[PDB]
Structure formats: C-alpha cells, structure tokens
Amino acid sequence: ERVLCLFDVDGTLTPARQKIDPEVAAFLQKLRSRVQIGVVGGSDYCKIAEQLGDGDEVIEKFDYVFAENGTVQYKHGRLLSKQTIQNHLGEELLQDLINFCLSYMALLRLPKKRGTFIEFRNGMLNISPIGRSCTLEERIEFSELDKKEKIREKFVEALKTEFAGKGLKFSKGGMISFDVFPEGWDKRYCLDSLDQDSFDTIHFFGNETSPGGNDFEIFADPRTVGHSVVSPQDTVQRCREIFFP
Amino acid sequence: ERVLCLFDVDGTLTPARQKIDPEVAAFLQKLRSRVQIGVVGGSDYCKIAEQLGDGDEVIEKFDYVFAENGTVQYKHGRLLSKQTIQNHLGEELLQDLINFCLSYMALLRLPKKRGTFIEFRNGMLNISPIGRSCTLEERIEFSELDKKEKIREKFVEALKTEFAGKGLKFSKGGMISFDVFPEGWDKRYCLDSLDQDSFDTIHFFGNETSPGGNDFEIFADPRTVGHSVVSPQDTVQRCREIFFP
Ligand SMILES: [Mg+2]
Ligand SMILES: [Mg+2]
Ligand SMILES: [Mg+2]
Ligand SMILES: [Mg+2]
C-alpha cells in the first residue's frame, strides 16, 4: 500500500547525461498520484539536478533524490546528511589508494595531460588519467586514446590487484574517468536508508541490470522488485503496465 | 588625461579573501568620476567577483577586471578571450611538469590526503600537496603541518631546480597550495593588453610591492606609476591625496 518506484537516471529516465523528455517527466508526475517516486544516480547532485528539471526543482518533483549512489540523499524536499568515504575507509587505506594512483599516473606518458586527476567526492574518488579539466574536442580525443591504449582498464586491473581483499570497488565513469568506492557503495547504499521509511514494496528500474552493470546489485537485492528497461519509453511502458493496467 | 587606477585586491582594496568594506567600495565609485578603475588578482574570476559585490556586479563597478593575473580579462562589462597556459607552454613541458608533480606528491606520506592535487586553470597550475577538497578544520590542520614540515617550500625548491632555465615561476597561494605559471604571467601580464587602450598614466596600487611579493613586478614595471599601500584605508588615503587634493 505504501509503494516507492526508484529509477536509475542515465538510460532509464533520460537519454544519457541529458535532459529528460517532458513527456517522460509528465508521466512520472502522473505515476506519483499512485506511488512515491525517486531517482538514484552515480553522478553528483548538480549533474542529476540539471538533467531532471530547472535548478533544484528535482527535489520537488521527486520524493527521493539519491546522488552518488545514495551517499547523498534528498528526501521530500530536504537534504539528509552524508557519510564520508574517509570516515568509512579511514585515512591510512585512503592514502595508500591515493598515493598508488598518483604514482601510477606519474608514470603514464601520454600525448597530453590536464588537471584534477583525483577528485574527492562524498561516496567515491573519481580518477581521471587525462584530466577532468578538458574541453569537448579533448574529451573525444582522450576517449579515443583510452580505447586504444586501455588506459583506465589497465589502471583498474593494477588497482584491484594491489588492493585485493581490502574492500574497494571500481567501475568506469563513461569517458576519461573511473570511480573508486567502498564495497557496498554501489546503488544498494540507498536501500539502507529506504529500509527506515516503511515501504511495503520498492520497485527498481534500471537499464544496466545485467551482471557487470551499475544497476545490477540494487536490481538483484531482495529488498527490491527488480525491473529491466532499455529506454525511457520502456520505463514508462512498464510503469503503465504495473500501475495503470 | 586618460588615467587608469589599477588595484591589487587582497590587502589593497579588501581584507584578504573577504568582502570589500562598503566605504572603500563607495570611494572607488567616487574615484571613478575622475579616472577609470580596475582590479588585478591572482585568484579566479568567481573568487574576485565574490569579494567585490554581488554575483557579477564587479564587471559593472570596475572598468577592468583582470583575474588570474590578467590571463582572464573583463573590459567595460564584457569578457575578452584568454590565452591558455598550454598554448603558451606547449604540451611536452606542461606534462613534464605535471608528471614531476604527481611523482613527487605520490612519495609524500602525510597524516591525511584529499583530492584535486593539480588544478588546471587558465594562467596557472595550482598545486596542493594535501588537497583542494578539504574543509576549514582541515585547511587549518594542513596549514599547521605545512609550516612544520615545509611541504610546499621543499616541493617548490625541487621544482625550480628540475625546471631551471625552462621559464616557470612559483609563488605560494596562501594556505595549502602554490601556483605554477609561465615566466611573465605574474601581474605584469595585464599590462600588455592595457598598452592597447591608450592610457596616459597607469597608477598601480599594491600591498606586496617589496621584492618577493606578488605585486612587485607590476609595481616596478616602467609602464606604471607604482604605489605601496598597507591597507584599504591606506589605499583610499593615497587616491585622495593624488586625485582629490
Ligand atoms: Mg542507467
Ligand atoms: Mg530486487
Ligand atoms: Mg595584495
Ligand atoms: Mg611602475
């Protein structure tokens, strides 16, 4: 009777990294007459906020806004505090990680390099072996280089081996970067808080629910009814079938 | 007859890193009835904009806004393009620099580390051996550590030696960070563009005009009438004496 629908963002509600279609948006508000609705994305809040309305409207349009996998949470218009990756990991392991990344990147000799190789967020370190500080022509340029030299991939292989058994996970962040987060700080993190809000059912929709994907763990988790979608139209489709039959 | 007064920001017009006193601000507008006025700061535009009014008002209140030593320039309400440190330095030297900084920082084992060790701006690399991504308690904490271990200072000594004769300059950025810029991209950079605006006199005011300080080179440059000030009140004082005697 208390139902929440929880959506991944990229590919599930919106074209990847882009604004939502006003028609999907319009539907989500309709869905809201029956159930509460929320989103969970890997990206920071501002990025998510941008894709889903104007300014900070997203927190008004959605009952739940879980950014950075849920390490950052908005609930019914208001911010709830965030745990810090350093509080969770502690300083020593976090610095072993950081120094390893610095020492590995120092040895990479590329065509170009830019800035902000290691960005410290709430629920992850975002690592970019070229530089988060590049333009569009440069994003595409490194994107090509990464494919050819497997830069991120080899870096991740080396990181996983070095920190084997120490509770870190790595997943790519699309172009030029990868994330490093504590084990358990994938999308499932948001479920722990949601456990306290007395939902009878939590429907999750995601487009990467296959093994490997960033939606897998939350989709497979026994706390959710899992749904696999291919597009924003597939998502609306499914919600119609279940909630408006 | 065409006169410009050009002010450094921190310590010259405003308490360091802080909002301008409405009384100084009020005076600067009065000064503007006689002469054009401008500012030049080491910081980025947003930082400068914040200290000097609300939002982007600074470009309306000042005839010239030279941020990042002049590599970024506003002139009479509008932005003029910026040269890029990489266009000036080229990719190879810039990456030698970057990799050297990465390799040096990887070997620093500190109490803590955070993120954004190398921030790529327009007219410099800002290097922070702890992490630009820290809070106030942490800024103060590293600030203490830096004093005791001479972290930035030893890093700079090593950088200057390594890149001896290669045209790079280093100056500290107050707490936790230092800047790396091409030789000539201190405050004097803004004078090259100002040369094209047909001023009969350019008065410069700065509080670090002693050798070593970030105001020295522009103060000593034969293109300006140089003035040494100790406070925002000293600045207003001097402008009264010269322009309102
Ligand atoms: Mg997705
Ligand atoms: Mg499930
Ligand atoms: Mg000053
Ligand atoms: Mg002079």
GROMACS .gro file of C-alpha atoms and ligand atoms in nm:
model
  494
    1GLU     CA    1   0.000   0.000   0.000
    2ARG     CA    2   0.300   0.228   0.060
    3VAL     CA    3   0.486   0.191  -0.271
    4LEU     CA    4   0.803   0.354  -0.399
    5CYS     CA    5   0.927   0.347  -0.756
    6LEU     CA    6   1.301   0.402  -0.772
    7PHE     CA    7   1.465   0.482  -1.106
    8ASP     CA    8   1.816   0.490  -1.228
    9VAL     CA    9   1.875   0.809  -1.432
   10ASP     CA   10   2.102   0.758  -1.739
   11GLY     CA   11   1.924   0.539  -1.995
   12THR     CA   12   1.630   0.470  -1.765
   13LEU     CA   13   1.456   0.807  -1.742
   14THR     CA   14   1.675   1.027  -1.959
   15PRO     CA   15   1.900   0.997  -2.260
   16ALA     CA   16   2.247   0.952  -2.106
   17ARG     CA   17   2.377   1.271  -1.941
   18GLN     CA   18   2.092   1.469  -2.097
   19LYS     CA   19   1.768   1.646  -2.008
   20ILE     CA   20   1.455   1.436  -1.957
   21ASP     CA   21   1.185   1.434  -2.224
   22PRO     CA   22   0.892   1.648  -2.097
   23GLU     CA   23   0.670   1.352  -2.182
   24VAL     CA   24   0.856   1.112  -1.953
   25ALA     CA   25   0.870   1.388  -1.691
   26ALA     CA   26   0.495   1.437  -1.736
   27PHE     CA   27   0.438   1.067  -1.686
   28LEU     CA   28   0.648   1.047  -1.369
   29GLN     CA   29   0.425   1.308  -1.208
   30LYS     CA   30   0.123   1.100  -1.309
   31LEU     CA   31   0.281   0.788  -1.158
   32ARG     CA   32   0.323   0.994  -0.842
   33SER     CA   33  -0.053   1.002  -0.784
   34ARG     CA   34  -0.035   0.629  -0.702
   35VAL     CA   35   0.312   0.589  -0.556
   36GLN     CA   36   0.608   0.787  -0.429
   37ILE     CA   37   0.892   0.820  -0.678
   38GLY     CA   38   1.266   0.864  -0.658
   39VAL     CA   39   1.591   0.851  -0.855
   40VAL     CA   40   1.936   0.708  -0.785
   41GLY     CA   41   2.240   0.805  -0.991
   42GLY     CA   42   2.616   0.760  -0.976
   43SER     CA   43   2.670   1.130  -1.054
   44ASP     CA   44   2.681   1.425  -0.813
   45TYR     CA   45   2.363   1.608  -0.720
   46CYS     CA   46   2.413   1.907  -0.951
   47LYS     CA   47   2.455   1.684  -1.254
   48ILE     CA   48   2.138   1.489  -1.163
   49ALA     CA   49   1.950   1.811  -1.084
   50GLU     CA   50   2.042   1.953  -1.425
   51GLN     CA   51   1.906   1.652  -1.616
   52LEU     CA   52   1.572   1.643  -1.438
   53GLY     CA   53   1.438   1.999  -1.427
   54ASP     CA   54   1.546   2.358  -1.371
   55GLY     CA   55   1.790   2.438  -1.090
   56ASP     CA   56   1.683   2.248  -0.778
   57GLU     CA   57   1.329   2.157  -0.890
   58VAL     CA   58   1.427   1.789  -0.895
   59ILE     CA   59   1.386   1.767  -0.515
   60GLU     CA   60   1.031   1.894  -0.554
   61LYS     CA   61   0.941   1.674  -0.849
   62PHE     CA   62   1.081   1.360  -0.685
   63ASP     CA   63   1.015   1.225  -0.341
   64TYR     CA   64   1.371   1.091  -0.323
   65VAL     CA   65   1.690   1.214  -0.483
   66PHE     CA   66   1.984   0.979  -0.420
   67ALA     CA   67   2.300   1.110  -0.579
   68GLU     CA   68   2.641   0.947  -0.570
   69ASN     CA   69   2.471   0.610  -0.522
   70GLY     CA   70   2.277   0.733  -0.217
   71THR     CA   71   2.574   0.861  -0.016
   72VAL     CA   72   2.399   1.192  -0.077
   73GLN     CA   73   2.025   1.190  -0.015
   74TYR     CA   74   1.737   1.432  -0.056
   75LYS     CA   75   1.404   1.326   0.096
   76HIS     CA   76   1.078   1.519   0.044
   77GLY     CA   77   1.245   1.848  -0.044
   78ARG     CA   78   1.525   1.843   0.210
   79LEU     CA   79   1.883   1.725   0.245
   80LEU     CA   80   1.981   1.435   0.478
   81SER     CA   81   2.347   1.420   0.583
   82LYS     CA   82   2.607   1.212   0.402
   83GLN     CA   83   2.866   0.967   0.531
   84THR     CA   84   3.217   1.042   0.412
   85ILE     CA   85   3.429   0.794   0.222
   86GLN     CA   86   3.715   0.884   0.457
   87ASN     CA   87   3.504   0.823   0.771
   88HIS     CA   88   3.416   0.482   0.626
   89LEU     CA   89   3.758   0.387   0.483
   90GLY     CA   90   3.978   0.568   0.732
   91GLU     CA   91   4.281   0.782   0.642
   92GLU     CA   92   4.551   0.518   0.601
   93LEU     CA   93   4.386   0.298   0.338
   94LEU     CA   94   4.250   0.608   0.164
   95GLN     CA   95   4.606   0.748   0.133
   96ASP     CA   96   4.758   0.418   0.023
   97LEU     CA   97   4.497   0.430  -0.253
   98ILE     CA   98   4.567   0.792  -0.337
   99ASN     CA   99   4.944   0.756  -0.344
  100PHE     CA  100   4.918   0.444  -0.555
  101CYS     CA  101   4.702   0.637  -0.803
  102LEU     CA  102   4.944   0.933  -0.807
  103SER     CA  103   5.246   0.710  -0.856
  104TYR     CA  104   5.079   0.513  -1.136
  105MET     CA  105   4.961   0.830  -1.315
  106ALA     CA  106   5.305   0.995  -1.285
  107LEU     CA  107   5.443   0.708  -1.491
  108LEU     CA  108   5.181   0.745  -1.766
  109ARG     CA  109   5.339   0.943  -2.051
  110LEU     CA  110   5.054   1.047  -2.284
  111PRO     CA  111   5.002   1.287  -2.575
  112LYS     CA  112   4.855   1.545  -2.333
  113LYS     CA  113   4.760   1.580  -1.965
  114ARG     CA  114   4.538   1.830  -1.786
  115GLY     CA  115   4.416   1.872  -1.428
  116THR     CA  116   4.215   1.725  -1.140
  117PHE     CA  117   4.339   1.368  -1.175
  118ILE     CA  118   4.187   1.272  -0.839
  119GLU     CA  119   3.854   1.430  -0.738
  120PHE     CA  120   3.746   1.363  -0.382
  121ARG     CA  121   3.365   1.331  -0.363
  122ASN     CA  122   3.133   1.208  -0.085
  123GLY     CA  123   3.094   0.845  -0.186
  124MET     CA  124   3.394   0.797  -0.416
  125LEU     CA  125   3.725   0.905  -0.563
  126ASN     CA  126   3.680   0.988  -0.928
  127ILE     CA  127   4.005   0.915  -1.109
  128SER     CA  128   4.080   1.062  -1.448
  129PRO     CA  129   4.414   0.963  -1.607
  130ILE     CA  130   4.398   1.259  -1.853
  131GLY     CA  131   4.226   1.534  -1.658
  132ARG     CA  132   3.870   1.630  -1.567
  133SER     CA  133   3.961   1.985  -1.683
  134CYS     CA  134   3.941   1.930  -2.059
  135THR     CA  135   3.707   2.053  -2.336
  136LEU     CA  136   3.478   1.857  -2.574
  137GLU     CA  137   3.735   1.812  -2.851
  138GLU     CA  138   3.975   1.690  -2.581
  139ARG     CA  139   3.722   1.459  -2.418
  140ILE     CA  140   3.674   1.289  -2.753
  141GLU     CA  141   4.047   1.286  -2.815
  142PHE     CA  142   4.128   1.108  -2.487
  143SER     CA  143   3.826   0.885  -2.525
  144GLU     CA  144   3.983   0.755  -2.847
  145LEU     CA  145   4.322   0.720  -2.679
  146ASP     CA  146   4.176   0.532  -2.383
  147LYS     CA  147   4.013   0.276  -2.616
  148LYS     CA  148   4.335   0.216  -2.800
  149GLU     CA  149   4.570   0.202  -2.503
  150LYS     CA  150   4.320   0.060  -2.250
  151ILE     CA  151   4.442   0.329  -2.006
  152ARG     CA  152   4.161   0.318  -1.747
  153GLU     CA  153   4.124  -0.059  -1.778
  154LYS     CA  154   4.492  -0.138  -1.714
  155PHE     CA  155   4.495   0.112  -1.426
  156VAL     CA  156   4.191  -0.062  -1.273
  157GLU     CA  157   4.347  -0.409  -1.315
  158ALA     CA  158   4.654  -0.284  -1.128
  159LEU     CA  159   4.446  -0.118  -0.857
  160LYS     CA  160   4.226  -0.425  -0.796
  161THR     CA  161   4.529  -0.647  -0.760
  162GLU     CA  162   4.715  -0.408  -0.526
  163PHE     CA  163   4.412  -0.365  -0.302
  164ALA     CA  164   4.288  -0.722  -0.328
  165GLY     CA  165   4.082  -0.816  -0.024
  166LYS     CA  166   4.072  -0.458   0.105
  167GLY     CA  167   3.713  -0.368   0.018
  168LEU     CA  168   3.732  -0.131  -0.280
  169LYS     CA  169   3.529  -0.142  -0.598
  170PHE     CA  170   3.598   0.010  -0.936
  171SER     CA  171   3.353   0.095  -1.211
  172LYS     CA  172   3.403   0.320  -1.508
  173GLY     CA  173   3.253   0.671  -1.526
  174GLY     CA  174   3.194   0.665  -1.901
  175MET     CA  175   3.459   0.881  -2.065
  176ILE     CA  176   3.808   0.958  -1.931
  177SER     CA  177   3.737   0.853  -1.568
  178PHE     CA  178   3.663   0.571  -1.324
  179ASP     CA  179   3.519   0.562  -0.973
  180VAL     CA  180   3.666   0.407  -0.662
  181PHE     CA  181   3.420   0.339  -0.381
  182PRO     CA  182   3.394   0.118  -0.070
  183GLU     CA  183   3.241  -0.225  -0.129
  184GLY     CA  184   2.868  -0.179  -0.077
  185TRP     CA  185   2.865   0.181  -0.202
  186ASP     CA  186   2.712   0.091  -0.536
  187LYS     CA  187   2.343   0.177  -0.586
  188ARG     CA  188   2.247  -0.061  -0.298
  189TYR     CA  189   2.365   0.200  -0.048
  190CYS     CA  190   2.041   0.395  -0.087
  191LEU     CA  191   1.838   0.090   0.026
  192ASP     CA  192   1.970   0.108   0.382
  193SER     CA  193   1.807   0.443   0.444
  194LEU     CA  194   1.494   0.344   0.248
  195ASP     CA  195   1.459   0.049   0.488
  196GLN     CA  196   1.364   0.304   0.756
  197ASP     CA  197   1.075   0.457   0.557
  198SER     CA  198   0.832   0.165   0.581
  199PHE     CA  199   0.761   0.090   0.216
  200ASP     CA  200   0.561  -0.226   0.150
  201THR     CA  201   0.720  -0.252  -0.192
  202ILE     CA  202   1.020  -0.093  -0.362
  203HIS     CA  203   1.022  -0.118  -0.739
  204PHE     CA  204   1.355  -0.055  -0.901
  205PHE     CA  205   1.403   0.024  -1.270
  206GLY     CA  206   1.741   0.023  -1.439
  207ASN     CA  207   1.898  -0.031  -1.780
  208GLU     CA  208   2.219  -0.195  -1.657
  209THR     CA  209   2.070  -0.481  -1.457
  210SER     CA  210   2.281  -0.742  -1.635
  211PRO     CA  211   2.587  -0.859  -1.438
  212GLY     CA  212   2.863  -0.602  -1.466
  213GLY     CA  213   2.625  -0.304  -1.495
  214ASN     CA  214   2.587  -0.028  -1.234
  215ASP     CA  215   2.222  -0.127  -1.173
  216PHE     CA  216   2.288  -0.495  -1.106
  217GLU     CA  217   2.327  -0.505  -0.731
  218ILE     CA  218   2.028  -0.289  -0.644
  219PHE     CA  219   1.818  -0.473  -0.903
  220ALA     CA  220   1.912  -0.815  -0.765
  221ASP     CA  221   1.883  -0.714  -0.398
  222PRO     CA  222   1.596  -0.891  -0.223
  223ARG     CA  223   1.476  -0.552  -0.090
  224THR     CA  224   1.353  -0.452  -0.432
  225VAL     CA  225   1.123  -0.579  -0.703
  226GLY     CA  226   1.362  -0.551  -0.995
  227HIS     CA  227   1.284  -0.429  -1.345
  228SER     CA  228   1.499  -0.421  -1.658
  229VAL     CA  229   1.441  -0.148  -1.910
  230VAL     CA  230   1.608  -0.048  -2.237
  231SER     CA  231   1.483   0.310  -2.276
  232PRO     CA  232   1.283   0.589  -2.112
  233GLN     CA  233   0.990   0.468  -2.326
  234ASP     CA  234   1.038   0.113  -2.198
  235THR     CA  235   1.030   0.250  -1.845
  236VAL     CA  236   0.703   0.441  -1.891
  237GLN     CA  237   0.567   0.136  -2.068
  238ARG     CA  238   0.644  -0.089  -1.772
  239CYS     CA  239   0.502   0.151  -1.511
  240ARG     CA  240   0.182   0.177  -1.713
  241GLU     CA  241   0.151  -0.200  -1.722
  242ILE     CA  242   0.204  -0.242  -1.349
  243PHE     CA  243   0.035   0.065  -1.201
  244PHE     CA  244  -0.214   0.165  -1.469
  245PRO     CA  245  -0.340  -0.167  -1.612
  246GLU     CA  246   4.422   6.300  -1.926
  247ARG     CA  247   4.317   5.937  -1.981
  248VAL     CA  248   4.403   5.786  -1.641
  249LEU     CA  249   4.356   5.435  -1.505
  250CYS     CA  250   4.392   5.331  -1.143
  251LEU     CA  251   4.471   4.962  -1.114
  252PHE     CA  252   4.441   4.790  -0.776
  253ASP     CA  253   4.551   4.462  -0.640
  254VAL     CA  254   4.265   4.300  -0.443
  255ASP     CA  255   4.380   4.114  -0.126
  256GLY     CA  256   4.512   4.365   0.128
  257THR     CA  257   4.484   4.658  -0.111
  258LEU     CA  258   4.108   4.701  -0.150
  259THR     CA  259   3.970   4.425   0.069
  260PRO     CA  260   4.065   4.234   0.380
  261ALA     CA  261   4.235   3.921   0.241
  262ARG     CA  262   3.989   3.682   0.073
  263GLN     CA  263   3.697   3.884   0.211
  264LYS     CA  264   3.422   4.123   0.105
  265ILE     CA  265   3.510   4.488   0.047
  266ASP     CA  266   3.407   4.748   0.303
  267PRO     CA  267   3.109   4.944   0.159
  268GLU     CA  268   3.305   5.258   0.243
  269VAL     CA  269   3.604   5.161   0.029
  270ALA     CA  270   3.361   5.045  -0.240
  271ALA     CA  271   3.182   5.379  -0.212
  272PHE     CA  272   3.511   5.561  -0.254
  273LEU     CA  273   3.615   5.363  -0.562
  274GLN     CA  274   3.299   5.475  -0.738
  275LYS     CA  275   3.384   5.834  -0.644
  276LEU     CA  276   3.737   5.792  -0.780
  277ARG     CA  277   3.572   5.671  -1.100
  278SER     CA  278   3.435   6.018  -1.173
  279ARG     CA  279   3.793   6.131  -1.244
  280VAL     CA  280   3.958   5.816  -1.374
  281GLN     CA  281   3.882   5.466  -1.495
  282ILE     CA  282   3.941   5.195  -1.236
  283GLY     CA  283   4.032   4.829  -1.242
  284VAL     CA  284   4.149   4.536  -1.032
  285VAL     CA  285   4.407   4.261  -1.084
  286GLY     CA  286   4.415   3.948  -0.869
  287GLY     CA  287   4.589   3.612  -0.868
  288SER     CA  288   4.258   3.433  -0.797
  289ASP     CA  289   3.996   3.313  -1.047
  290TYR     CA  290   3.717   3.543  -1.157
  291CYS     CA  291   3.446   3.397  -0.932
  292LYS     CA  292   3.657   3.445  -0.622
  293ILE     CA  293   3.732   3.808  -0.720
  294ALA     CA  294   3.368   3.868  -0.816
  295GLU     CA  295   3.254   3.742  -0.475
  296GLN     CA  296   3.480   3.980  -0.281
  297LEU     CA  297   3.379   4.291  -0.473
  298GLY     CA  298   2.999   4.291  -0.499
  299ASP     CA  299   2.702   4.062  -0.560
  300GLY     CA  300   2.725   3.798  -0.833
  301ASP     CA  301   2.878   3.956  -1.143
  302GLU     CA  302   2.834   4.323  -1.043
  303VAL     CA  303   3.213   4.361  -1.024
  304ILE     CA  304   3.234   4.396  -1.405
  305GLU     CA  305   2.989   4.685  -1.384
  306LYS     CA  306   3.152   4.854  -1.087
  307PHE     CA  307   3.501   4.829  -1.236
  308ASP     CA  308   3.618   4.929  -1.578
  309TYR     CA  309   3.869   4.642  -1.579
  310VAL     CA  310   3.859   4.305  -1.409
  311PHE     CA  311   4.184   4.111  -1.454
  312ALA     CA  312   4.167   3.773  -1.286
  313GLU     CA  313   4.439   3.511  -1.277
  314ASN     CA  314   4.697   3.787  -1.323
  315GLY     CA  315   4.526   3.918  -1.638
  316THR     CA  316   4.518   3.589  -1.831
  317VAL     CA  317   4.144   3.638  -1.786
  318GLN     CA  318   4.018   3.987  -1.863
  319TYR     CA  319   3.689   4.172  -1.840
  320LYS     CA  320   3.677   4.517  -2.002
  321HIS     CA  321   3.381   4.756  -1.969
  322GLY     CA  322   3.127   4.486  -1.883
  323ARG     CA  323   3.241   4.219  -2.126
  324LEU     CA  324   3.478   3.924  -2.143
  325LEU     CA  325   3.793   3.928  -2.364
  326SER     CA  326   3.940   3.588  -2.453
  327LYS     CA  327   4.217   3.423  -2.257
  328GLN     CA  328   4.542   3.263  -2.369
  329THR     CA  329   4.591   2.912  -2.238
  330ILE     CA  330   4.890   2.806  -2.032
  331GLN     CA  331   4.915   2.500  -2.259
  332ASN     CA  332   4.911   2.710  -2.579
  333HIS     CA  333   5.193   2.916  -2.428
  334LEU     CA  334   5.396   2.634  -2.269
  335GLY     CA  335   5.314   2.357  -2.514
  336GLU     CA  336   5.216   2.001  -2.418
  337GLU     CA  337   5.556   1.842  -2.359
  338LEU     CA  338   5.693   2.081  -2.097
  339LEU     CA  339   5.349   2.104  -1.937
  340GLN     CA  340   5.341   1.723  -1.896
  341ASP     CA  341   5.700   1.700  -1.771
  342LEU     CA  342   5.586   1.948  -1.506
  343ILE     CA  343   5.268   1.757  -1.429
  344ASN     CA  344   5.433   1.417  -1.406
  345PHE     CA  345   5.708   1.557  -1.188
  346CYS     CA  346   5.441   1.698  -0.954
  347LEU     CA  347   5.250   1.368  -0.948
  348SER     CA  348   5.562   1.165  -0.881
  349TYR     CA  349   5.677   1.398  -0.603
  350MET     CA  350   5.331   1.402  -0.437
  351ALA     CA  351   5.299   1.022  -0.458
  352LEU     CA  352   5.607   0.999  -0.239
  353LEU     CA  353   5.470   1.238   0.025
  354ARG     CA  354   5.329   1.029   0.310
  355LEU     CA  355   5.122   1.266   0.528
  356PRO     CA  356   4.868   1.237   0.810
  357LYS     CA  357   4.585   1.278   0.555
  358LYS     CA  358   4.533   1.344   0.183
  359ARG     CA  359   4.229   1.459  -0.011
  360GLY     CA  360   4.161   1.549  -0.375
  361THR     CA  361   4.240   1.781  -0.667
  362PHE     CA  362   4.616   1.791  -0.617
  363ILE     CA  363   4.666   1.958  -0.956
  364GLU     CA  364   4.405   2.210  -1.074
  365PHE     CA  365   4.445   2.326  -1.432
  366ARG     CA  366   4.342   2.693  -1.466
  367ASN     CA  367   4.386   2.945  -1.749
  368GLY     CA  368   4.708   3.112  -1.640
  369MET     CA  369   4.849   2.855  -1.397
  370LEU     CA  370   4.858   2.512  -1.240
  371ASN     CA  371   4.750   2.535  -0.880
  372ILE     CA  372   4.926   2.261  -0.684
  373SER     CA  373   4.800   2.149  -0.346
  374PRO     CA  374   5.004   1.875  -0.172
  375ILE     CA  375   4.711   1.793   0.065
  376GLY     CA  376   4.401   1.852  -0.143
  377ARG     CA  377   4.191   2.149  -0.252
  378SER     CA  378   3.886   1.943  -0.142
  379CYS     CA  379   3.915   1.990   0.234
  380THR     CA  380   3.707   2.174   0.499
  381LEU     CA  381   3.801   2.463   0.732
  382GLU     CA  382   3.922   2.246   1.020
  383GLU     CA  383   4.130   2.058   0.763
  384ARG     CA  384   4.265   2.371   0.597
  385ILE     CA  385   4.394   2.484   0.934
  386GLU     CA  386   4.525   2.138   1.012
  387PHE     CA  387   4.733   2.116   0.693
  388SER     CA  388   4.834   2.478   0.724
  389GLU     CA  389   4.998   2.385   1.056
  390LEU     CA  390   5.156   2.076   0.903
  391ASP     CA  391   5.292   2.271   0.606
  392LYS     CA  392   5.465   2.520   0.839
  393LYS     CA  393   5.628   2.244   1.038
  394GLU     CA  394   5.735   2.022   0.750
  395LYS     CA  395   5.790   2.299   0.492
  396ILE     CA  396   5.591   2.083   0.245
  397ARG     CA  397   5.513   2.342  -0.024
  398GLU     CA  398   5.851   2.511   0.016
  399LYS     CA  399   6.057   2.192  -0.031
  400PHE     CA  400   5.836   2.094  -0.326
  401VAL     CA  401   5.898   2.435  -0.486
  402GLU     CA  402   6.276   2.412  -0.428
  403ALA     CA  403   6.274   2.076  -0.605
  404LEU     CA  404   6.057   2.204  -0.889
  405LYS     CA  405   6.269   2.517  -0.950
  406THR     CA  406   6.585   2.310  -0.968
  407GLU     CA  407   6.435   2.046  -1.201
  408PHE     CA  408   6.298   2.308  -1.438
  409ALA     CA  409   6.587   2.550  -1.407
  410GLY     CA  410   6.615   2.768  -1.716
  411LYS     CA  411   6.282   2.648  -1.855
  412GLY     CA  412   6.068   2.954  -1.786
  413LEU     CA  413   5.841   2.862  -1.494
  414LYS     CA  414   5.768   3.064  -1.184
  415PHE     CA  415   5.637   2.956  -0.848
  416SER     CA  416   5.460   3.162  -0.585
  417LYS     CA  417   5.256   3.045  -0.293
  418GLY     CA  418   4.874   3.062  -0.290
  419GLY     CA  419   4.844   3.130   0.082
  420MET     CA  420   4.728   2.810   0.251
  421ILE     CA  421   4.783   2.453   0.128
  422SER     CA  422   4.870   2.546  -0.234
  423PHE     CA  423   5.119   2.708  -0.473
  424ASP     CA  424   5.091   2.836  -0.830
  425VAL     CA  425   5.299   2.745  -1.129
  426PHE     CA  426   5.288   2.990  -1.418
  427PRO     CA  427   5.498   3.084  -1.723
  428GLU     CA  428   5.764   3.350  -1.662
  429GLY     CA  429   5.592   3.681  -1.730
  430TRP     CA  430   5.249   3.561  -1.615
  431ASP     CA  431   5.266   3.744  -1.285
  432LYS     CA  432   5.055   4.061  -1.252
  433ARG     CA  433   5.255   4.227  -1.536
  434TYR     CA  434   5.062   4.018  -1.789
  435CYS     CA  435   4.765   4.253  -1.768
  436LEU     CA  436   4.983   4.548  -1.881
  437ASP     CA  437   5.027   4.408  -2.231
  438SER     CA  438   4.658   4.441  -2.309
  439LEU     CA  439   4.634   4.774  -2.124
  440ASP     CA  440   4.907   4.904  -2.357
  441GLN     CA  441   4.645   4.896  -2.635
  442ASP     CA  442   4.393   5.118  -2.452
  443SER     CA  443   4.583   5.448  -2.477
  444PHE     CA  444   4.614   5.550  -2.114
  445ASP     CA  445   4.836   5.850  -2.047
  446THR     CA  446   4.903   5.720  -1.698
  447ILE     CA  447   4.853   5.388  -1.521
  448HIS     CA  448   4.861   5.406  -1.143
  449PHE     CA  449   4.913   5.076  -0.970
  450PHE     CA  450   4.841   5.014  -0.602
  451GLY     CA  451   4.954   4.702  -0.419
  452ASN     CA  452   5.045   4.584  -0.071
  453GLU     CA  453   5.316   4.338  -0.176
  454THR     CA  454   5.539   4.572  -0.375
  455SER     CA  455   5.851   4.471  -0.182
  456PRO     CA  456   6.076   4.221  -0.363
  457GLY     CA  457   5.931   3.873  -0.331
  458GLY     CA  458   5.567   3.991  -0.320
  459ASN     CA  459   5.306   3.923  -0.589
  460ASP     CA  460   5.273   4.298  -0.662
  461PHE     CA  461   5.643   4.363  -0.716
  462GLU     CA  462   5.681   4.320  -1.088
  463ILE     CA  463   5.378   4.521  -1.193
  464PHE     CA  464   5.466   4.790  -0.939
  465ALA     CA  465   5.825   4.818  -1.063
  466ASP     CA  466   5.734   4.800  -1.434
  467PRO     CA  467   5.806   5.126  -1.614
  468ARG     CA  468   5.453   5.115  -1.762
  469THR     CA  469   5.303   5.205  -1.428
  470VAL     CA  470   5.330   5.472  -1.163
  471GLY     CA  471   5.376   5.246  -0.863
  472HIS     CA  472   5.220   5.287  -0.520
  473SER     CA  473   5.275   5.091  -0.198
  474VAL     CA  474   4.989   5.056   0.044
  475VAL     CA  475   4.942   4.874   0.374
  476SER     CA  476   4.561   4.865   0.398
  477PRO     CA  477   4.237   4.951   0.218
  478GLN     CA  478   4.238   5.273   0.424
  479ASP     CA  479   4.593   5.350   0.308
  480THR     CA  480   4.475   5.299  -0.049
  481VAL     CA  481   4.180   5.539  -0.021
  482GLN     CA  482   4.411   5.778   0.158
  483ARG     CA  483   4.661   5.777  -0.128
  484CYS     CA  484   4.397   5.819  -0.401
  485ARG     CA  485   4.252   6.114  -0.213
  486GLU     CA  486   4.594   6.276  -0.194
  487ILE     CA  487   4.666   6.231  -0.564
  488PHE     CA  488   4.326   6.277  -0.727
  489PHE     CA  489   4.134   6.483  -0.472
  490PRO     CA  490   4.396   6.721  -0.325
  491MG      MG  491   2.122   0.372  -1.647
  492MG      MG  492   1.548  -0.691  -0.617
  493MG      MG  493   4.752   4.229  -0.207
  494MG      MG  494   5.587   5.112  -1.229
   0.00000   0.00000   0.00000
